[PDB]
């Protein structure tokens, strides 16, 4: 390698060290508020007073900010220099900085956040040393001028290279630039680690979740014509969807619902994966908007399926979990809803699962089949299952009522089902102990 | 008034010739058709503008 | 008369001096006229100002012909609102495009 | 169709109009769009005007009959703007087309026949 | 009946669905400011359906 | 064991007649192609067609799809189940991928593919997935030797596609799904 | 699961028979029954703060190889007995050094652009040439133009190769009577 | 840290751990997929 390349590595290692007056000036002029002229003349005490006032206001707004007054915004931190610390002490300081940035991500629209983050910018050089966490925490605000100020004073990591032309520019980054930023796989791994930390520490909020959901959905849409890129996108996005579903936050759950719906529409997934995602959706479901989104998600996920086991009944555990979460009258009023997204595959699988397991809501099966319009293959599968159930079950009444309904609508399909099963219509009349045929 | 009419029709013929050449400059498949009288015409292919 | 004028006239209305000196001296014509003071053209930047002027002149011609020639009109400006929505879609597309390489 | 759309032609006249429009499209004797039809009416270089009766709202088209009555130019209504656009030879629907004037045009006889058939409607 | 006739019933069963292309959700960035997550989900479902 | 034969005839305007050949050729119905100018081709698909016939009377099925192809390069695609009622029906899709006259319309025996082709220019063949009504992207390709496509045939069973062109070549492809 | 490297070794000869991480190194040495010995290395992460979460996939470092099937044909490439040419039934033509095994290299089958400017043709899923049944090599014009002719099994043309570049050349020599190539020869 | 030794939230994580190919191809779905075609020249 070149001597110049090795010296470049040396310079990158000793970037923040103020080895003389000019380096001190260049490092200290970087600020989120003041210009370079004022910033060079300011000392640490003045910035510390303003940052302590800002942290007092931040603690009055959010009480969790008061824990940082003993560790980062204390009076002892004025004389703490990073470069004379060891690696363990720098690691502890980095953990504290990460926790502060995670907590301060939501409040960046407030004025005290900027004045309090001045102290971390100027004492602890986070725009040089904690750059990635700063960008990931403030990445939602790319319209706003505070992100412009961060971009102006910041250095860029390797993973943030789509923003290289938006440094020191009046025009903000665009939505296409953010999509191109997210479209990298390693950036997605870094961002899913960040979201894992946010979900683990309960720091997710609505503007963040809307931004990440829109970016993930647009990444899926951009990769929709490459099946290899989509196949690589399966683990990252489905792990982060599982983690968002594990959250207690209904906004996190709705974000995971959106990701699952778009991603299932873009890529035809295995039925095992669809059923496992449905189990994960149904497991931690406790809020009303989450239920409303989750039912539509389940209907769309089942409408996606096109394999041989397409219309097959649910497994017993998943069916009982669905029955516990979503109730019969809720299914009925979901069909009464005027919007009514296409859900015939899920409704038919639900009907066959009811006939397999419950054995007591055959009139509910009748009501569902009256309210939804099913296709011939689905009706044929339902009719065959009901014929088997008529052979098994001792009581015929709940089933025979369904069978006059099936004579009323598509009688010839019932005849062909009986012929396929080897039964004559009069033999089925003997089975039902009632004459139902013309 | 008659001279105004003559200038107007002369400018009309000039503009028609310019517009014919400006249509040749564009994008399409065209065929040169030479009449027996000697007039030069161009006929375009039956193709729809994308 | 403003309804019977086409959209290309409505774009350059008020810039007749520059328009006709350019048309008489074989120079470049104005990109816009009185419509430079509409709010949407102001939101446009750079080369997108002429594009938004062209789009807005076309939609203004549509809305203004409707506004003059309709026998039955509800005085709500719904045609104007739909055309404004279309112009805002076009403006958002033009502004979201960037020229520097990422 | 809208009552303001007048004169609307029948199926056979619509056939002949759209055939002549296709021939003019192949010969580059056609102007597409209400703005360009307005320009040809102003400049006096239009044979006749074809307008699509299913334009919504129709008042985008309705300024053209006034200009046609002023400059004494025949105009006609055909039912479908999709049909008019496909005859004009473009991938977009077209609500107004203008047949321009050319004496050396090979389709002059067809243009003048359809023009007379349109004028009988305007009588 | 035949298994071919049953397969034809499946094939006539499948109906039209909207597909995802690259410029399907680019306009969603305009309105992520004040709206809620359920409203975003409704917009996404409207695009997909 | 009983079926009826319907003749579906289209003129250049777009008006479509349907005759019942069993009832002395009297007219069942008449309707109009939406958009509809310069129509060259009409073709049903998804059931027993003249391209793919039945091997017995019980195998006769109705056709789900109808396609109308014009001089402009437009193909209007009608779903018959909804289009038999309107007498001025709306197409499910209008395809403008080709810019020259539609001279070949064909369907797969299942009707999942519509093959539309033009003999006017080279390499003017497109395969359309139904019911999504979407053109396949990866095929045909810039290096596909279609030529000036004058004739198209679909195999009844094998899933083969035979394309005959102006150089006299008939090239053959197999769809691996079939 | 960090990563999956698919088909680094052929399934028929036994797949990955041995793979060993070297001690303290981000280098794994792999081998299989197909006469290959490869190495893969892990680059350092592109993230500074994240690190262990964001892991780049392993990349190919270096390998040694040979024929996977017995050689169909051999020849000596020069008078110094430095190098041999060997074509095998696994459709590979190799150059093997008698002086140092590192200098052995597989002749590249990447085609050239046609002189007229037309497209070459053939399947986009690229496969190797049919097995070579005959070979002729003359080093009188090595470095100037093609100096190897090979006759391949069940083909009606012969292929030329350049030994200086170690790659297939730009001419295919036809039989012009609709027959398979049985013999090749070259002038001195 | 760990030894391996009524819905569960870990179902998706476990199925992602198990399967390596996520797209469904062995089902023989007999409905033709929309945008990509499997076609070979004879």
The DSSP H or E segment spanning A80 is: none
Residue H36: CB partners within 8 Å, gap ≥ 6? A227, F136, F137, F138
Residue G18: CB atoms within 10 Å = 11
CB contact under 8 A, A268 and H24: yes
Q: Which two tokens stand for residue A39?
A: 């910033």
CB contact under 8 A, F72 and B48: yes
- Asked whether B43 and B33 are in contact (CB, 8 A), the reply is yes
Residue C22: CB atoms within 10 Å = 14
Tell how strand G71-76 and strand F26-32 pair up.
Answer: unpaired
Handedness of CA D68, D73, D76, D82 (dihedral sign): negative
Measured CA to CA, the distance from residue A298 to residue A296 in angstroms comes to 5
Residues from chain F contacting residue G124 (CB–CB below 8 Å): 143
Question: In this complex, is the C-beta atom of E19 within 8 Å of any C-beta atom belonging to chain H?
Answer: yes
Q: What are phi and psi of H15, to 5 degrees?
A: -70, -30
Residue A317: CB partners within 8 Å, gap ≥ 6? A279, H6, H7
- Asked whether E16 and F92 are in contact (CB, 8 A), the reply is yes
> What region, left, alpha or beta, does residue A75 occupy, with left being phi > 0 and alpha being psi -120 to 50 degrees?
alpha
Could you say which DSSP state residue A202 is in? T
The upper half-sphere exposure of residue G118, i.e. CA atoms within 13 Å in the direction of its Cβ, equals 5
Measured CA to CA, the distance from residue A333 to residue A353 in angstroms comes to 19
Residues from chain E contacting residue A341 (CB–CB below 8 Å): 45, 49
Measured CA to CA, the distance from residue A353 to residue A359 in angstroms comes to 10
Transcribe A261-330 into DSSP letters. HHHHHHSPBPHHHHHHHHHHHHHT--SHHHHHHHHHHHHHHHHH--STTSSPPPPHHHHHHHHHHS-HHH
Measured CA to CA, the distance from residue C71 to residue G103 in angstroms comes to 91
Residues from chain C contacting residue D59 (CB–CB below 8 Å): 65-66, 68-70
Measured CA to CA, the distance from residue A81 to residue F19 in angstroms comes to 93
Domain range summary for chain D, segments of one domain joined by +: 1-123
Measured CA to CA, the distance from residue A272 to residue F119 in angstroms comes to 47
Distances G133 to G75, G139, G155, G185 between C-alpha atoms, Å? 12, 20, 10, 13
Measured CA to CA, the distance from residue D8 to residue D76 in angstroms comes to 6
Q: What are phi and psi of G164, to 5 degrees?
A: -70, -50
Largest CA distance in chain B: 47
Find, among A260, A259, A257, the residue nearest to A284 by Cα. Answer: A257
Q: Which two tokens stand for residue F120?
A: 């006017």
Report the 3 state secondary structure along F122-149.
CCCEEEEECCCCEECCCCCCCCCCCCCE
Q: Which two tokens stand for residue B13?
A: 């013929």
Of chain E residues 8-27, which have a CB less than 8 A from chain A? Answer: 9-10, 12-15, 17, 19-26
Find, among A103, A113, A98, A100, the residue nearest to A33 by Cα. Answer: A113
The DSSP H or E segment spanning F27 is: strand F26-32
Handedness of CA A185, A189, A194, A198 (dihedral sign): positive
Experimental method: cryo-EM
Strand partners, F161: F154, F173
Residues from chain C contacting residue A163 (CB–CB below 8 Å): 102
Measured CA to CA, the distance from residue D39 to residue F68 in angstroms comes to 36
- Asked whether B39 and D104 are in contact (CB, 8 A), the reply is yes
Transcribe chain G into DSSP letters. -------SS-TTTTS--EEEEPTTSSEEEEEETTTEEEEEE-PPPS-SSS-TTS-PPPEEEEEEE--SS-EEEEEE-SSSS-EEEEEETTS-EEEEESS-GGG-EEPB-PPPPPSS-----S-SS--PPPPEEEEEE-GGGTTTS--EEEEETT-SEEEEEETTTTEEEEEEEE-SSS----------
Q: Which two tokens stand for residue A228?
A: 């290899």
Do chains G and D touch, with touching meaning 3 or more CB–CB pairs less than 8 Å apart?
Answer: no
Nearest residue of E to residue C95 by CA position?
A: E30
Task: Provide the H-helix boundaries in chain H.
Answer: 11-18
Size of interface G-H (CB pairs under 8 A): 3
Task: Provide the H-helix boundaries in C7-77.
Answer: 7-12, 16-25, 39-43, 48-69
**∠ at Cα G91 (G87, G94), nearest 5°?**
40
Question: In this complex, is the C-beta atom of D63 within 8 Å of any C-beta atom belonging to chain C?
Answer: yes
Residues from chain F contacting residue E11 (CB–CB below 8 Å): 110-112
- Asked whether A256 and A289 are in contact (CB, 8 A), the reply is no
- Cα G48 off chain centre by: 39
CATH superfamily of this structure's domain D1-123: Ribosomal protein L30/S12 (3.30.1330.30)
Measured CA to CA, the distance from residue A354 to residue A366 in angstroms comes to 11
Nearest residue of F to residue H39 by CA position?
A: F175
Nearest residue of F to residue E19 by CA position?
A: F132
Measured CA to CA, the distance from residue A213 to residue A257 in angstroms comes to 10
Residue G157: CB atoms within 10 Å = 14
Measured CA to CA, the distance from residue G128 to residue G159 in angstroms comes to 13
Order of strands across the sheet that contains F160-165: F149-154, F160-165, F170-175, H39-41
Q: Which two tokens stand for residue D97?
A: 């087309």
CB contact under 8 A, A189 and G53: yes
- Asked whether D75 and D64 are in contact (CB, 8 A), the reply is yes
Q: Which two tokens stand for residue A125?
A: 């050089």
Residue A225: CB atoms within 10 Å = 16
Could you say which DSSP state residue D9 is in? P
Measured CA to CA, the distance from residue F127 to residue F140 in angstroms comes to 8
Measured CA to CA, the distance from residue A367 to residue A68 in angstroms comes to 60
Residue F5: CB partners within 8 Å, gap ≥ 6? F20, F21, F22
Distances G144 to G162, G164, G165 between C-alpha atoms, Å? 9, 9, 10
- Asked whether D5 and D75 are in contact (CB, 8 A), the reply is no
Handedness of CA A309, A314, A318, A323 (dihedral sign): positive
Of the candidates G49, G55, G56, which has its C-beta nearest A132's C-beta? Answer: G49
The upper half-sphere exposure of residue F130, i.e. CA atoms within 13 Å in the direction of its Cβ, equals 29
- Asked whether C22 and C29 are in contact (CB, 8 A), the reply is yes
Could you say which DSSP state residue D33 is in? S
Give percent helix, percent strand, percent coil of chain C, each to the nearest 5.
65, 0, 35
Q: Which two tokens stand for residue G117?
A: 């400017």
Measured CA to CA, the distance from residue H32 to residue F46 in angstroms comes to 14
Q: Which two tokens stand for residue D36?
A: 């360009």
Residue A51: CB partners within 8 Å, gap ≥ 6? A73, A115, A116, A118, A119
Handedness of CA A111, A112, A118, A124 (dihedral sign): negative
Tokens 């006259």 sit at which residue? F101
Measured CA to CA, the distance from residue F100 to residue F121 in angstroms comes to 7
CA distance F103 to chain H (A): 23
CA distance E22 to chain A (A): 4
Give SS3 for A27. helix
Q: Which two tokens stand for residue D102?
A: 């050319």
CB contact under 8 A, E15 and F46: no
Measured CA to CA, the distance from residue A218 to residue A181 in angstroms comes to 11
CA distance E40 to chain F (A): 26
CB contact under 8 A, A300 and E37: no
Distances A161 to A125, A151, A164, A167, F147 between C-alpha atoms, Å? 21, 12, 5, 11, 45
- Asked whether H34 and F134 are in contact (CB, 8 A), the reply is yes
Measured CA to CA, the distance from residue C95 to residue C90 in angstroms comes to 9
Task: Please tell me whether the peptide bond between A195 and the residue prior to it is cis, using omega within 30 degrees of 0.
Answer: no
**∠ at Cα A378 (A374, A384), nearest 5°?**
130
Residue A161: CB partners within 8 Å, gap ≥ 6? none
- Asked whether H42 and F160 are in contact (CB, 8 A), the reply is yes
> Based on the number of CB atoms within 10 Å of its own CB, is G152 exposed (0-12), middle (13-18) or buried (19 or more)?
buried
Strand partners, F105: F116
Tokens 């309707």 sit at which residue? F31
Residue F137: CB atoms within 10 Å = 11
Tokens 């499946």 sit at which residue? E10
The DSSP H or E segment spanning F8 is: strand F6-10
Give SS3 for A250. helix
- Asked whether F61 and F122 are in contact (CB, 8 A), the reply is no
Tell how strand D75-78 and strand D46-52 pair up.
Answer: parallel
Task: Provide the H-helix boundaries in A337-375.
Answer: 344-353, 362-371
Measured CA to CA, the distance from residue D35 to residue D60 in angstroms comes to 10
Measured CA to CA, the distance from residue A100 to residue A54 in angstroms comes to 14
Measured CA to CA, the distance from residue F173 to residue F113 in angstroms comes to 14
CB contact under 8 A, A292 and E28: no
Measured CA to CA, the distance from residue G76 to residue G68 in angstroms comes to 21
Tokens 């009982």 sit at which residue? A320
Q: Which two tokens stand for residue D96?
A: 């107004």
Of chain D residues 50-109, which have a CB less than 8 A from chain F? Answer: 80, 82-83, 86-87, 89, 91
Q: What are phi and psi of D63, to 5 degrees?
A: -75, -20
């Amino acid at each position: 390698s070149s001597l110049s390349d090795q010296l470049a590595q040396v310079a990158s290692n000793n970037a923040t060290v103020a080895l003389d007056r000019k380096r001190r000036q260049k490092l200290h002029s970087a600020s989120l508020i003041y210009n370079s002229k004022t910033a060079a003349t300011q000392d640490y005490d003045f910035i510390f007073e303003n940052a302590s006032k800002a942290l007092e206001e931040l603690s009055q707004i959010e009480p969790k900010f008061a824990i940082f007054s003993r560790t980062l915004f204390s009076e002892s931190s004025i004389s703490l220099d990073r470069n004379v610390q060891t690696k363990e002490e720098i690691k502890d300081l980095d953990n504290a900085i990460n926790a502060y940035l995670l907590l301060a991500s939501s409040k960046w629209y407030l004025a005290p956040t900027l004045h309090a983050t001045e102290w971390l910018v100027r004492r602890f050089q986070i725009h040089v040393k904690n750059t990635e966490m700063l960008l990931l925490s403030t990445l939602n605000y790319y319209q706003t001028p505070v992100f412009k100020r961060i971009l102006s004073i910041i250095k860029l990591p390797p993973l943030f290279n789509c923003l290289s032309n938006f440094v020191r520019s009046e025009k903000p980054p665009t939505a296409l630039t953010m999509i191109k930023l997210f479209n990298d796989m390693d950036f997605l791994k870094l961002y899913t680690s960040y979201l894992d930390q946010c979900i683990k520490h309960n720091a997710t909020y609505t503007n963040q979740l809307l931004f990440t959901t829109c970016c993930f959905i647009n990444v899926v849409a951009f990769n929709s014509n490459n099946d290899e890129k989509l196949n690589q996108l399966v683990p990252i996005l489905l792990e982060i969807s599982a983690k968002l579903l594990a959250s207690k936050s209904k906004d996190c759950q709705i974000a995971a619902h959106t990701i699952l719906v778009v991603f299932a529409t873009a890529l035809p997934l295995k039925k095992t994966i669809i059923l496992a995602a449905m189990e994960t959706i149904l497991s931690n479901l406790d809020a009303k908007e989450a239920k409303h989104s989750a039912l539509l998600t389940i209907c769309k996920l089942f409408q996606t399926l096109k394999g041989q086991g397409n219309v097959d009944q649910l497994p017993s555990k998943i069916f009982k979990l669905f029955d516990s979460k979503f109730d019969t009258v809720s299914i009925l009023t979901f069909l009464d809803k005027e919007d009514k997204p296409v859900c015939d595959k899920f409704i038919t699988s639900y009907t066959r699962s009811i006939a397999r397991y419950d054995r007591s809501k055959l009139n509910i099966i009748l009501s569902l089949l009256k309210k939804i319009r099913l296709e011939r293959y689905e009706v044929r599968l339902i009719i065959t299952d009901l014929i088997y159930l008529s052979e098994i079950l001792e009581d015929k009444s709940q089933l025979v009522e369904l069978f006059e309904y099936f004579i009323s609508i598509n009688e010839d399909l019932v005849l062909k089902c009986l012929k396929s099963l080897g039964l004559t219509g009069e033999l089925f009349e003997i089975r039902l102990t009632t004459s139902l045929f013309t | 008034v008659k001279q105004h009419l003559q200038r107007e029709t002369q400018l009309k013929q000039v503009q028609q010739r310019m517009d014919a050449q400006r249509e040749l400059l564009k994008k399409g498949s065209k065929k040169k058709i030479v009449d027996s009288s000697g007039k030069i015409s161009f006929k375009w292919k039956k193709q729809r503008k994308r | 008369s403003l309804a019977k004028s086409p959209a290309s006239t409505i774009q350059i209305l008020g810039a007749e001096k520059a328009l006709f000196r350019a048309l008489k001296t074989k120079h470049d014509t104005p990109k816009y006229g009185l419509l430079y003071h509409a709010s949407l053209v102001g939101q446009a930047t750079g080369k997108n100002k002429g594009k938004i002027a062209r789009v807005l002149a076309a939609k203004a011609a549509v809305s203004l012909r409707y506004d003059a020639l309709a026998e039955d009109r509800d005085d709500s400006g719904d045609i104007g609102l739909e055309s404004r929505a279309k112009v805002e879609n076009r403006l958002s597309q033009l502004e979201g495009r960037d020229l520097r390489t990422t | 169709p809208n009552p303001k759309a007048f004169p609307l032609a029948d199926a056979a006249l619509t056939q002949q109009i759209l055939d002549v429009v296709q021939q003019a499209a192949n010969l580059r004797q056609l102007k597409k769009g209400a703005n360009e039809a307005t320009k040809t009416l102003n400049r006096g270089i239009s044979e006749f005007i074809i307008m699509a009766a299913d334009c919504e709202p129709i008042e985008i088209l309705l300024h053209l009959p006034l200009l046609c009555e002023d400059k004494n130019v025949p105009y006609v209504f055909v039912p479908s703007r999709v049909a008019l656009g496909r005859a004009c030879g473009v991938s977009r629907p077209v609500i107004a087309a203008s047949i321009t004037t050319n004496d050396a045009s090979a389709i002059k006889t067809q243009i003048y026949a359809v023009k007379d058939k349109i004028e009988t409607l305007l009588i | 009946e035949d298994e071919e006739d049953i397969a034809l019933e499946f094939i006539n069963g499948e109906k039209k669905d909207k597909l995802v292309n690259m410029n399907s959700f680019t306009s969603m960035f305009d309105n992520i400011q004040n709206v809620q997550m359920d409203t975003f989900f409704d917009r996404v479902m409207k695009v997909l359906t | 064991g009983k079926f009826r034969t319907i003749l579906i005839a289209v003129n250049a305007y777009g008006e479509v007649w349907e005759f019942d050949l069993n009832k002395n050729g009297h007219v069942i119905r008449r309707w109009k192609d939406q958009g509809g100018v310069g129509i060259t081709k009409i073709q049903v698909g998804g059931g027993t067609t003249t391209t793919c016939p039945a091997l017995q009377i019980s195998k006769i099925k109705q056709n789900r799809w109808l396609a109308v192809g014009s001089e402009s390069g437009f193909v209007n695609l009608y779903d018959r189940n909804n289009a038999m009622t309107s007498s001025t029906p709306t197409p499910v899709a209008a395809l403008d991928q080709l810019t020259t006259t539609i001279s070949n319309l064909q369907f797969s025996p299942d009707g999942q593919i519509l093959c539309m082709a033009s003999r006017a220019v080279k390499d003017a063949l497109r395969l359309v997935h139904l019911p999504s009504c979407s053109v396949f992207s990866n095929w045909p390709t810039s290096g596909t030797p279609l030529g000036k496509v004058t004739s198209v045939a679909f195999s009844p069973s094998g899933g083969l596609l035979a394309v005959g062109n102006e150089q006299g070549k008939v090239r053959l492809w197999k769809l691996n799904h079939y | 699961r960090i990563h999956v490297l698919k088909n680094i070794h052929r399934e028929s000869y036994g797949g990955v028979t041995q793979a060993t991480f070297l001690n303290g190194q981000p280098i794994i040495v792999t081998s299989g029954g197909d006469n290959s010995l490869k190495e893969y290395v892990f680059d350092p992460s592109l993230s500074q703060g994240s690190g262990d979460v964001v892991v780049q996939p392993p990349r190919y470092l270096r390998s040694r190889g040979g024929h996977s099937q017995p050689p169909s044909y051999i020849a000596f490439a020069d008078s110094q007995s430095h190098f041999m040419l060997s074509a095998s039934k696994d459709r590979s033509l190799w150059s093997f050094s008698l002086r140092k095994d590192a200098q052995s290299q597989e002749m590249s089958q990447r085609l050239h652009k046609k002189q007229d400017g037309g497209r070459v043709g053939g399947s986009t899923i690229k496969s190797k040439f049919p097995e070579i049944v005959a070979l002729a090599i003359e080093n009188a014009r090595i470095g100037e133009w093609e100096n190897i002719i090979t006759a391949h099994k069940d083909e009606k043309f012969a292929r030329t190769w350049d030994m200086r570049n170690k790659r297939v050349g730009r001419w295919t020599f036809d039989t012009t009577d609709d027959g398979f190539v049985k013999s090749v020869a070259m002038s001195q | 840290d760990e030894s391996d030794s009524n819905g569960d939230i870990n179902a998706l994580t476990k199925i992602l751990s198990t399967t390596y190919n996520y797209k469904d191809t062995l089902s023989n779905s007999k409905l033709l997929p929309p945008k990509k075609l499997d076609i070979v020249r004879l």
